């Protein structure tokens, strides 16, 4: 049976989370054991480097923050959740988190290095992905979330910005800055103005059903190439998401119009994912009736673009100022990150 | 067209989060 087979799954899942959860790894590399190749990315926080583990000459992309930073920015709880779900979670679309330690000016997350880039480049490039190009994204994101919101786990941030390619043309979810583990509701503003669903803008209280909307979101921007709602400013964005309507390009099946109907629902009785058949009324959807979901969660689907190749192996990347990474002799803000 | 307004809204970059 495939849905016993879904429930053992899940449940093993869980058992293994939870004890990662409860004793997190800490202190499992340090910053002499990398040589910096680039900066990848660069924030409010710190930044994203991709990086040389000397030992072995794996590349990987190490996430920097500045503790002073984090704890001026009021970030120091999103930073410890960030780095405990990354340690605890274990999927073949989430990224692995390979060390972390602490110096006395910063936090360190060595992760999995992607090196297709983000979706956001290539969606911009191309201008829209076809169908099943777009399906075969979309059907990433739905196990994940399938697997996520089994944990408890409420994403919070979906967007093609965040979405990162692999060597097999296959996404991985990266960034959980904005994850929380919670049963019930939840009441935070988080997330992206785009890809905030309507009760999250009306300050109601909400839970996982916002992640199946920001899937429509995602869906609909992928197959388009432009959000279903935006406007020059966060507040008229809102306005329109809030408003209860959505117009489609002509050039949407039938099957995909209907699904987005379904996510793009501002009644929470109604959205997909959030009924009493869960996730299954998605995965069954006629939009999603070629797609075959144990060969996705497999990887044996062939991937519908496998990423010119310039002077380097980071050519295609956008050129960030190379900044140091000063380590004063002064510990900074050591009581805050302790459980890091 | 739709494309053209997305265009205009200038939030064609990478979006950032709240």
Redesign the interface.
């Known amino acids: 049976s495939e849905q016993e087979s879904v429930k053992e799954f899940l449940a093993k899942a869980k058992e293994d989370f939870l004890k990662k959860w409860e004793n997190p790894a800490q202190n499992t590399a340090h910053l002499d054991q990398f040589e910096r190749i680039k900066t990848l990315g660069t924030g409010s926080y710190g930044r994203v480097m991709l990086v040389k583990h000397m030992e072995t000459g794996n590349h990987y992309a190490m996430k920097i923050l500045d503790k002073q930073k984090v704890v001026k920015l009021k970030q120091i709880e999103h930073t410890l959740n960030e780095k405990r779900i990354l340690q605890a979670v274990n999927f073949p679309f989430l990224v692995k988190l390979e060390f972390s330690f602490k110096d006395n000016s910063n936090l360190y997350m060595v992760l999995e290095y992607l090196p297709g880039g983000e979706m956001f480049s290539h969606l911009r490039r191309i201008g829209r992905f076809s169908e099943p190009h777009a399906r075969f994204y979309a059907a990433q994101i739905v196990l994940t979330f399938e697997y996520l919101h089994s944990l408890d786990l409420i994403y919070r941030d979906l967007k093609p910005e965040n979405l990162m390619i692999d060597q097999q043309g296959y996404i991985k979810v990266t960034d959980f800055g904005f994850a929380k583990r919670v049963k019930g509701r939840t009441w935070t503003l988080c997330g992206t103005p785009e890809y905030l669903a309507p009760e999250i803008i009306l300050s109601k209280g909400y839970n996982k059903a916002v992640d199946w909307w920001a899937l429509g979101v995602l869906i609909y921007e992928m197959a388009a190439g432009y959000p279903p709602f935006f406007a020059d400013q966060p507040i008229q964005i809102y306005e329109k998401i809030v408003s209860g309507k959505v117009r489609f390009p002509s050039h949407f099946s039938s099957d995909l119009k209907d699904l987005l109907r379904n996510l793009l629902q501002v009644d929470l009785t109604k959205r997909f994912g959030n009924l009493k058949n869960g996730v299954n009324d998605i995965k069954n959807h006629k939009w999603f009736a070629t797609t075959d979901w144990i060969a996705i969660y497999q990887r044996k689907v062939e991937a519908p673009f496998i990423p010119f190749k310039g002077p380097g192996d980071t050519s295609n990347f956008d050129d960030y100022e190379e900044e140091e990474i000063r380590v004063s002799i002064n510990e900074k803000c050591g009581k805050e990150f302790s459980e890091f | 067209t739709?494309?053209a307004?997305?265009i205009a809204?200038?939030?064609?970059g990478?979006?950032?989060?709240?």
Do not use: K
């Open positions: 739709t494309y307004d997305f809204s200038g939030r064609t990478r979006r950032n989060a709240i």
